[PDB]
């Protein structure tokens, strides 16, 4: 029969842990680092592009920061392809909500739905889990700026500052060291870059190896604006903060 | 060896054996003894009912399938219930659709095929019970032996279960004698009780311990238990 070749991706270890989730997490830990920092007037998302080349087209590239909504975006740490499958269903869920209630989807509802999809691959179906961890950056009129994180287990939590992928331990300690409740978007932008700068497994931290995004509520308007920085823009903010 | 080829019914051993089927057959051997024999006018079933405690009952081993057909089981009782139920339905279909009583020979073919399906597919298991089928149809008295392997055979008499070998040799000896017990049921039954007792060893067939069933020319398949079998002990 087939039973012989079944890995049984959804069983408990004698210690009550889920093998595949633990191994998927191990996979994630080797992924480019992604950081999320929430400020009083906005949120910052930054990620390190794992592996690059002279010939890689950075202007047309995007492997870590995706727009899910006009008010929500995510930073990815793990298998890009797996992430894309989840990102697309997340985009659909957001539109179903909008069509049903004629209101943008509250950040947590969307994060919970995505986390639930992941949880499923954990309890039934016999399929491998998604090797992905997300950092959600969004805004809604009930909780304002919010930062969440979800991983292969389907568990999710909220943060003021968080990191996923490689060297999160070092990154977290640095963040927990300089973060301050009354920070400001610009302060956060700088904190994010400094942290990545000290955790990178690379020589220096250049712009061609980064992706940046911010969600601010442009004072001159009154609405929320997402901004996925362009190559040049990253190069700039890189010199200003003193990393050149 | 074996251990590597007895994991499921969909695997042949290097010598062409099906161990799961053979292990199922083992459930029969571990089952209480039952005997069957027929003349030209009747067919009889005699079975030794086994009990758990002296506080428990002696589990029935004879199931009526239709006014003209019935059987005795040895092994997993639930599997007998399933198979006899399928037999009850096939007998029923024959009457309702064709107004025809099902031929014992056909009943045997149907059972063989139903068991065969659980020996070539993954996920299922062979049936773990043996059956002795008796009946009177348009060609007289009949006795069939059903094995979980799907093998069904027509005999003048036979026995299955633990120590069944005793009763079987006895019948193979008494053949020329009982095969002629026509027109006399009591004799055929007695001849059956004598064959069955040839497999005793533990105790002796008592009243609430012996079970007999008969069918024939002008006798609808009926089961006798307890006081009803007293006159045969």
């Amino acid at each position: 029969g087939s039973r012989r070749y079944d890995s049984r991706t959804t069983i408990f270890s004698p210690e009550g842990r889920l093998y595949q989730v633990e191994y998927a997490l191990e996979s994630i830990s080797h992924a480019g680092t992604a950081i999320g920092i929430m400020a009083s007037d906005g949120i910052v998302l930054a990620a390190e592009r794992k592996v690059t080349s002279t010939l890689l087209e950075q202007d047309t590239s995007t492997e870590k920061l995706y727009k899910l909504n006009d008010k929500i975006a995510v930073a990815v740490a793990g298998l890009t392809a797996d992430a894309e499958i989840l990102i697309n269903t997340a985009r659909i869920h957001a539109q179903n909500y909008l069509k049903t209630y004629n209101e943008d989807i509250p950040v947590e509802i969307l994060v919970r739905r995505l986390s639930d999809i992941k949880q499923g691959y954990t309890q039934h179906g016999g399929l491998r889990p998604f090797g992905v961890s997300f950092i959600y950056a969004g805004y809604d009129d009930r909780y304002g700026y919010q930062l969440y994180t979800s991983n292969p287990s389907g568990n999710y939590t909220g943060w003021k500052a968080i990191s996923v992928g490689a060297n999160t331990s070092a990154a977290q300690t640095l963040l927990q060291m300089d973060y301050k409740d009354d920070m400001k978007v610009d302060d956060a932008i700088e904190l994010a870059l400094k942290t990545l700068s000290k955790t990178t497994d690379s020589s220096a931290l250049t712009y061609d190896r980064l992706e940046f995004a911010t969600i601010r509520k442009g004072a001159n308007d009154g609405e929320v604006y997402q901004k996925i920085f362009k190559p040049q823009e990253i190069k700039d903010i890189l010199v200003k903060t003193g990393i050149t | 060896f074996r251990n590597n080829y007895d994991g499921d019914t969909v695997t042949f051993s290097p010598t062409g054996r099906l161990f799961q089927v053979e292990y199922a057959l083992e459930a029969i051997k571990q089952g209480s003894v039952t005997v069957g024999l027929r003349s030209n006018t009747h067919a009889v079933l005699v079975a030794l009912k086994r009990n758990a405690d002296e506080l428990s009952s002696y589990q029935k081993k004879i199931i009526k399938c239709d006014e003209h057909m019935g059987l005795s089981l040895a092994g997993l009782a639930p599997d007998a219930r399933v198979l006899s139920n399928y037999l009850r339905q096939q007998c029923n279909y024959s009457s309702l659709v064709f107004n025809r009583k099902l031929a014992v020979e056909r009943a045997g073919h149907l059972l063989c095929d139903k068991a065969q399906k659980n020996t070539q597919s993954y996920g299922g298991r062979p049936y773990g019970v043996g059956l002795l089928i008796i009946g009177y149809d348009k060609s007289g008295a009949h006795l069939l032996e059903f094995q979980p392997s799907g093998n069904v055979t027509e005999l003048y008499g036979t026995a299955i279960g633990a120590r069944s070998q005793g009763a079987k040799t006895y019948l193979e000896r008494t053949l020329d004698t009982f095969i002629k017990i026509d027109g006399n049921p009591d004799e055929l039954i007695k001849a059956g009780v004598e064959a069955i007792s040839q497999s005793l060893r533990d105790e002796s067939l008592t009243v609430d311990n012996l079970s007999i069933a008969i069918v024939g020319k002008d006798t609808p398949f009926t089961i006798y238990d307890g006081e009803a079998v007293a006159k045969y002990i």
């Binding site: 070749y5 191994y23 080349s53 890689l56 392809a81 016999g126 399929l127 | -």
Partner: protein, 250 residues
Amino acid sequence: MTDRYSFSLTTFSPSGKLGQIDYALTAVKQGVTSLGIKATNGVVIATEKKSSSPLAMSETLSKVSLLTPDIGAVYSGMGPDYRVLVDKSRKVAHTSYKRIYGEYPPTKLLVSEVAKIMQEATQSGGVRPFGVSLLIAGHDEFNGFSLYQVDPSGSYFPWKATAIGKGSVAAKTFLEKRWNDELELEDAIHIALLTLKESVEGEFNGDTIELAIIGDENPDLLGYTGIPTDKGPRFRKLTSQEINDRLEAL
């Protein structure tokens, strides 16, 4: 019967590796080299027609395929896997796009569809990943020219130029030397030929090399006239003769 293999065949190992995908990549590594170079007014993709016998007609076997009139694909790895992928790609371009918007899909989206198909062979039950890496070159009005690589995992990335397969490491190094953001299509074709020569052991000519480009529209390849807005496909496979003419200027 009935596929009872409803569980994944690719799972995470203690180290976090996805074995089957890793192995699929190793298959791609043994495959014949293929590359793609993007110019300012076009893109060129090429590979070697490694005929498996002189009795075989290498023309009846195309490693470079048209997906849409403005998009082409080439590969490295398991040829059969590629063939079915091309069939599925050509069809998804219709079912998921042309039949909805009445126009062919932009390169990035079709690449996205192909990548999805490949990711599923990485998680669905009862299957193994595709043993190939594709290079997809194309053009679309709002994005211009582009070149993409799609790996067995389903991951894809945009390239200025690159190579996959057998001698990809050396070929990539050679491309990094000759590439610049001002190359004209003919220049890229030339650099493409030079790069491919280092990977070819035996004969190197228009009959052993397969090369196509995505450039200007070919009204002569449209099949009809009378509709101004329809100027023809941008995808064109070079002829054996067209290749040789450029080899003399090698």
